[PDB]
């Protein structure tokens, strides 16, 4: 089997992408944020504290003939910005782009933090990291991909994110019409539960390429590109007036600036992020200070190849016995 679904930016800055997901019988469609940096499928639901729901679409398991309470199971998770959610668990049928998993763990939120409440465009998350990061207790659960794997034509999924435009998630096949040239595959470490790999270096703008190993994760659920402070300083030093702002929380630059591109290595191949992809607009409405799309990972403990990097590529998440990652230009 295979599945194919369109993913759409939630706003004009590509802050996140949402993909429609069908849950239950009859189907309930929720727009979920696919997150290759976590491993929980959780949704706003009929169990969510009413004061914490504001415009989201909810899952109502009592309306699904296929829903079953996963008795005793609970979950709790927090994300990169300090947001969090928690609740109990059902199993139900879940379909993504025509691909169906029966008995999928669907984590029903009882509680969500304020920034989830305040974002009406995201109805929950669908984790696509390794199942070893799933937070359900006392019986850890598998991700949608893990569950689907044995049914798929090939044990892969691909992410083709758009810049200010829709893109695609495919399961079970590689669309050879979606990229240019060849796919370069690179080794993955699963020891921390992530799609963790090592980039071979970087360049800023038309500068010379610096060969240096940069360990990091391929993370569709992180908006920005988080790299070592050395790398990020070298980038922003090429932008007149750019500076790191403690009050704002990262590098900002004059909104009058045209930004240089950023290149990262994949083996002997190169992926080029156009400068416009690194511009995240005014720090506040009307401001002439703009927020940068490349930020320091210092303090995170890990480098993150988030959407800013991934949307410049066609990315293959290969879940074979020995997992790998592939990157192509597009």
UniProtKB/Swiss-Prot annotation:
Which cystines does this chain contain? 255-290
Question: EC annotation?
Answer: 3.4.23.22
One Gene Ontology molecular-function label: aspartic-type endopeptidase activity
Which residues are annotated as active site? 35, 199
Name the enzyme's class: hydrolase
Reaction(s) catalyzed by this protein? Hydrolysis of proteins with specificity similar to that of pepsin A, prefers hydrophobic residues at P1 and P1', but does not cleave 14-Ala-|-Leu-15 in the B chain of insulin or Z-Glu-Tyr. Clots milk
Source taxon at top rank: Eukaryota
The alphabetical list of record keywords is: Aspartyl protease, Disulfide bond, Hydrolase, Protease, Signal, Zymogen
Q: Which parts of the sequence belong to the Peptidase A1 domain?
A: 17-328
Give the family per the record.
Belongs to the peptidase A1 family.
Kindly provide the name given to this protein in its UniProt entry: Endothiapepsin
Q: Which residues of the full protein are shown?
A: 90 to 419 of 419
